[PDB]
């Protein structure tokens, strides 16, 4: 637990869904965790005195920087997990009109720009730490199988997640000399509030034929933290599903 | 992992040995399947057994699986046996020999399929524990994606391992058997029997992989029910250049 015990993690989207499960796994591994989210202070307040909540939109650099002052005050920042995100499902062409430009921009801004914003500012905080052996820290991003298998309606969602995939390797290369790994998880179908018919959804997953449990995402995050050789890679976490057009 | 039986090919050396040790530490009984290494495996204690077999020999592999089945329910199969190769397509002394290409494909690709298919037959006979009967983990290589000059046969064999991962996961899904492939980058094993400068080319960590890091990923795959039908590069972010 070298990069968690006595260290600080920042989890965006950490008050719900995949981020909440990750927060819990990190706390169980001994880290202090700053949850960065639009909302969820009550949930995070039930997680004990090693968790803190920072209200911030990941697309707002001043709010993210303020959250990172809090994180730094707790100890050396060594883990950043980008789970904040949203989706839409809109056809390119419809009788109602063309996919609105502002809707495409919004999804790209939150999912792609917001991830880069927290990554770049978080990397600055990790880079100033003393190495523990050969490592300063690790940044984990959330893409989606939609980066590869995008369905009808997913133009903006897939663009945003494809951007997260595409930037993983250059950022890993860029941060390598500072001893910061960068890895991306591409989840398949998980039982989170994002899916707020769910049973028939899970039947389409080859095996296990169910929605993913958010704790399985958190477990993979922890393995990435603990495995020094995982870097510059995207890992599908998806029960072998491949998403069909519909 | 406890109470279950695992089979590790290539388990007497390198990545397979580190995997065997991790599985034994997790409480499993392990049958090591290898061309040699009785002495190495004898030092691993009572929960490890050695079965001599060429992975391309279906009778010898079946005999190893009979031993495994006699210990308990077979739930984990790890394919680490393999060999490397570096021959140019054209060179002064002639064309890459067809027999050399066949040999690497036979050991690395056909041998992996042989152990996978016979291992799956044993896993499928077990009772599920919750939602799973077992998991099969294969070893590809970054050469499946980044093949260098000289690697025509090695990359062909490892690209075949990658290509068959999804259809086999789909095929075995109703029997509750996951299939995942690891694609290692550069690891400090007897396969590499100059190494310092090789490690310097890995972005981060800038060293050869420790076989235990491969074993750790194997154990995570076993413990994470959602990993299935996927290939995972384990490589320090390296991308192999032509030379
Ligand atoms: N659940 C799935 O099936 C699934 C599949 C593929 C990818 N994902 C991705 O996983 C990540 C987590 O989603 P989830 O399923 O946990 O959903 P979720 O809605 O439960 O959690 C997302 C969290 O992000 C927060 N958030 C949203 N926009 C934000 C912003 N601008 N700034 C700060 N916080 C913000 C939300 O308030 C929420 O707490 C997302 O990136 C999502 O796209 C989820
Ligand atoms: N070491 C690396 O840098 C590296 C990189 C990418 C992939 N790999 C792959 O990882 C796997 C493990 O290799 P390693 O590095 O541990 O090498 P290794 O030589 O240390 O171990 C391989 C083992 O497989 C056994 N073996 C070979 N052919 C066999 C056969 N026909 N039947 C049974 N056993 C056989 C050998 O006796 C040996 O014990 C191989 O598939 C290799 O191609 C290794």
């Amino acid at each position: 637990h070298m990069k968690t015990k006595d260290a600080v993690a920042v989890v965006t989207g950490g008050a719900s869904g995949l981020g909440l499960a990750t927060t819990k796994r990190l706390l169980d591994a001994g880290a202090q965790v700053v949850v960065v989210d639009l909302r969820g202070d009550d949930v995070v307040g039930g997680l004990g005195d090693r968790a803190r909540f920072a209200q911030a939109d990941v697309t707002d650099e001043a709010a993210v920087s303020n959250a990172l002052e809090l994180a730094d005050s707790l100890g050396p920042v060594r883990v950043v997990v980008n789970c904040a995100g949203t989706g839409n499902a809109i056809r390119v062409l419809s009788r109602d009109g063309v996919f609105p430009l502002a809707a495409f921009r919004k999804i790209v801004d939150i999912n792609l720009v917001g991830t880069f914003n927290v990554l770049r500012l978080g990397a600055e905080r990790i880079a100033k730490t003393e190495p523990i052996g050969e490592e300063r820290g690790v940044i984990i991003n959330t893409a989606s199988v939609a980066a590869f298998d995008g369905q009808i309606g997913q133009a903006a969602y897939s663009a945003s997640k494809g951007g997260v995939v595409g930037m993983t390797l250059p950022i890993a290369r860029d941060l390598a000399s500072k001893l910061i790994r960068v890895v991306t998880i591409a989840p398949g179908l998980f039982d989170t509030p994002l899916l707020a018919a769910k049973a028939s959804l899970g039947q389409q997953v080859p095996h296990p034929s169910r929605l993913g449990n958010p704790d399985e995402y958190g477990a993979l995050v922890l393995h990435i933290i603990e495995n020094p050789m995982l870097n510059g890679e995207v890992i599908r976490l998806d029960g072998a599903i491949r998403m069909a057009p519909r």
Side-chain angles (χ1 to χ4, degrees), chain A residues 37-95 97-98:
Chain A
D37 204 304
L38 297 172
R39 63 194 63 90
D41 45 278
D42 198 50
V43 167
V44 175
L47 302 180
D49 62 353
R50 290 181 77 77
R52 294 291 299 275
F53 183 84
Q55 185 200 317
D57 184 334
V58 292
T59 67
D60 175 343
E61 73 191 304
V64 170
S65 291
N66 187 58
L68 289 170
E69 319 296 346
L70 176 60
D72 265 359
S73 77
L74 300 177
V77 177
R78 298 195 184 278
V79 171
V80 173
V81 188
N82 284 296
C83 295
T86 188
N88 62 26
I90 304 171
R91 302 293 301 259
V92 177
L93 303 176
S94 79
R95 192 178 59 257
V98 181

